[PDB]
Amino acid sequence: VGKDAPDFTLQSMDGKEVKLSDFKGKKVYLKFWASWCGPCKKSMPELMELAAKPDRDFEILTVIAPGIQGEKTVEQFPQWFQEQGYKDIPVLYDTKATTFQAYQIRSIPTEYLIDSQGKIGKIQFGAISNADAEAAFKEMN
C-alpha cells in the first residue's frame, strides 16, 4: 500500500499551527515550492483556481523553507506573497527545512497527493494541472 506521508507540525503564514495528520479523513494536495522558483510561481494562479472550486474533497497545503536556499525570511515573505497578487493559498513555514528533508525534496515545485488515510498516492515533479490532480484524487480513498 501507499507509503505513509511523513507527518509535520508547522506554523502557517497566518499564524495557525498546521499538522498533517489532523487532516486524516480528507485528501491532501501538498506542494513544496520557493519564491525564487519561476515554474513554482507559474503554477500559483492555477492553484488559486483550484482553491476556489467549492466541491473539493481535498485540502491544499503549500510549504516553503524561509531564509533557506534563497527563500525570503518570515519577516518578508507574507508581504511578497500579497504583492504578487496571490491569495487563498495556505503557506507553511518549514523553518529548519526538516519537512523538505523528510519528503526527500531535491527539486521544486514538487506535489505530493495524499489520500484520506495519510498515504502517498502520487508524487509529481514540476507541473500538474487541476484536471490531473482531480483525476488522481478520484481514484484515492
Author numbering: 45 to 185
What does the paper say about this structure?
In addition, the molecular interplay of the surface-exposed TlpA (renamed Etrx1) with its extracellular paralogue Etrx2 on oxidative stress resistance and virulence are unknown. This study discovers the unique molecular architecture of two surface-exposed thioredoxin-systems, Etrx1 and Etrx2 and their redox partners CcdA1, CcdA2 and SpMsrAB2 as important pneumococcal extracellular reducing systems essential for pneumococcal pathogenesis and oxidative stress resistance. The bioinformatic analysis of pneumococcal genomes identified two genes encoding surface-exposed thioredoxin-like lipoproteins, renamed here Etrx1 and Etrx2. According to the accepted catalytic mechanism of thioredoxin-like proteins, Etrx1/Etrx2 would bind their redox partner SpMsrAB2 by means of a hydrophobic surface and subsequently perform a nucleophilic attack on the target disulphide bond via the N-terminal nucleophilic thiolate of the CXXC motif (Cys84 in Etrx1, Cys81 in Etrx2). Surface-exposed Etrx1 and Etrx2 deliver electrons to the SpMsrAB2 protein for the reduction of MsrA2 (by Etrx1 or Etrx2) and MsrB2 (by Etrx2) domains.
Attempts to obtain the reduced form of Etrx2 by co-crystallization with β-mercaptoethanol resulted in a new oxidized structure in which Etrx2 forms a complex with a 2-hydroxyethyl disulfide (HED) molecule. A different conformation of the β4–α3 loop was observed coupled with the presence of the HED molecule at the hydrophobic cavity. Etrx2 has an unprecedented hydrophobic cavity close to the active site. The presence of a hydrophobic patch near the active site has been associated with substrate recognition in other TDORs. In the structure of the oxidized forms of Etrx2, a detergent molecule (Cyclofos-3™) or a HED molecule is bound to this hydrophobic pocket, very likely mimicking the redox partner interaction. The CXXC motif (81CGPC84) defines the active site. Many thioredoxin-like proteins share also a proline residue within the CXXC motif. This proline residue is also present in the CXXC motif of Etrx2, but not in Etrx1. The Etrx2 binding site presents a hydrophobic character while Etrx1 presents a highly basic character in this region.
